[PDB]
Design a protein around this ligand. Structure first.
Ligand SMILES: *[C@@H]1O[C@H](CO)[C@@H](O)[C@H](O)[C@H]1NC(C)=O
Ligand SMILES: *[C@@H]1O[C@H](CO)[C@@H](O)[C@H](O)[C@H]1NC(C)=O
Ligand SMILES: [Ca+2]
Ligand SMILES: [Ca+2]
Ligand code: NA
Length: 424
């Protein structure tokens, strides 16, 4: 009915055949078949190997198919040693890709809504005395996919919906009518930031990025009436002090609360707080919070140099950001708007060269911590120095400079007198 990305056949190059469960027992069949449930295996939780025809787990001496409740016996297998053990008790690879047996490990799958607070599915689990190796629509009404979060639903009755990878928003998302972006606020869940990351990824989505004041106010609008602190995609992890959105959105808009971010050492992940009234803080990525997901289904004059259908030049005369912009206008251009990493590397290495810092034209003059290119071009990417943009020591820093070897960006008071770069 559904897909099965993690099921594989277990194939011996010692013999020529792949493992199956026929009868009650397990043998090697040269008749390898991807379609036959007896031959196809899935790693499940607690180091167990589940066979789809038997709906049972490999066990041990000898080898057998046994119900997976029956933890007793062994049923515990480790993928590095699995081949050596088959050789001794009956070389081995996954069939057809010939890769090692650790290539399709068991991953946890976090549950949407239900009573389990987002807790991961327990695979396999018993419901109505049947065993299941994944999500089913059985026992439900509506048809939706759910699993148990306990290994016997009859006893504990702890369950939740399955993350779906969909190109639509049906039933689990709020849609902003104006932007057609979809959002999921999981308030019951308590997950670490990395588990939340994994959960939005499992739905074909990604953790919340707030790229603009509209998006922020829509978020506030959906949070009216709650008290809560949720994970967002904003995080410090990938390199320390430089903030990034989980999805690769440019950091174009900043809602940090007053005197955030703090604790640069172990507080690496952002949260949105109804308390702050939608303000942002950073926190320790290991605490368990609710969390938010989203998805949206003629070369030039002398002294200018070409890059990618545009022209660039250095203006060496030290001037305020505003006067620099005027000198660019007097030519055929505006201050340089930067939409590529390749473009930043050309600018920094070929043009900036030894000059330490110059104006680039990215500015929050119109609305604080909402950054714009002077030429009206969309801000599609940023590269900031760590802890920038800060409006430093609580002063207005309304204009952006490139600084230092790497070409990372700083916000600065605009009356500062520096060089600049233009493009047309
Ligand atoms: C697998 O076995 C079934 C038995 O019904 C057979 O019909 C099918 O053609 C086999 N698949 C392949 C790929 O040979
Ligand atoms: C920028 O303007 C402010 C306000 O008038 C002034 O206090 C400051 O000294 C100026 N800085 C420079 C570098 O001109
Ligand atoms: Ca500013
Ligand atoms: Ca600054
Ligand atoms: Na904090």
């Amino acid at each position: 009915a559904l897909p099965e990305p993690n099921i594989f056949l277990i194939f011996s190059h010692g013999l020529q055949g792949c493992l199956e469960a026929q009868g009650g027992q397990v043998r090697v069949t040269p008749a390898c078949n991807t379609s036959l449930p007896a031959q196809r295996w899935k790693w499940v939780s607690r180091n167990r190997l589940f066979n789809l025809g038997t709906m049972q787990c490999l066990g041990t001496a000898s080898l057998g198919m046994y119900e997976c409740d029956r933890e007793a016996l062994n049923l515990r297998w480790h993928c590095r040693t699995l081949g050596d053990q088959l050789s001794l008790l009956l070389q081995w690879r996954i069939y057809g890709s010939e890769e090692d047996l650790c290539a399709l490990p068991y991953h946890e799958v976090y549950t949407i809504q239900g009573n389990s607070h987002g807790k991961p599915c327990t695979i396999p689990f018993k419901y109505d005395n049947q065993w299941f190796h994944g999500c089913t629509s059985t026992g439900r009404e509506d048809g939706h996919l759910w699993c148990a979060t306990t290994q016997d639903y009859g006893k504990d009755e702890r369950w939740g919906f399955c993350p779906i990878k969909s190109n639509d928003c049906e039933t689990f998302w709020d849609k902003d009518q104006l932007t057609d972006s979809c959002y999921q606020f999981n308030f019951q869940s308590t997950l670490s930031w990395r588990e939340a990351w994994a959960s939005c990824e499992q739905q074909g989505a990604d953790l919340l990025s707030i790229t603009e004041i509209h998006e922020q106010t829509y978020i506030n609008g959906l949070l009216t009436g709650y008290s809560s602190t949720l994970w967002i995609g904003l995080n410090d992890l990938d390199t320390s002090g430089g903030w990034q959105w989980s999805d690769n959105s440019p950091l174009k808009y900043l809602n940090w609360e007053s005197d955030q971010p703090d604790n640069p050492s172990e507080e690496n992940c952002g949260v949105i707080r109804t308390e702050s009234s939608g303000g942002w803080q950073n926190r320790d990525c290991s605490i368990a919070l609710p969390y938010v997901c989203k998805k949206k289904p003629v070369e030039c004059e002398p002294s200018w140099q070409p890059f990618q259908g545009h022209c660039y030049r250095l203006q060496a005369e030290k001037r305020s950001w505003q006067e620099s912009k005027k000198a660019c206008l007097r030519g055929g251009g505006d201050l340089v708007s930067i939409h590529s990493m390749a473009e930043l590397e050309f600018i920094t290495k070929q043009i900036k060269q030894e000059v330490e810092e110059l104006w680039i034209g990215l500015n929050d003059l119109k609305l604080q911590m909402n950054f714009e290119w002077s030429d009206g071009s969309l801000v599609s990417f940023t590269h900031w120095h760590p802890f920038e943009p800060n409006n430093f020591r609580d002063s207005l820093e309304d204009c952006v400079t490139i600084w230092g070897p790497e070409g990372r960006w700083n916000d600065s008071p605009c009356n500062q007198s520096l060089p600049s770069i233009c493009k047309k």
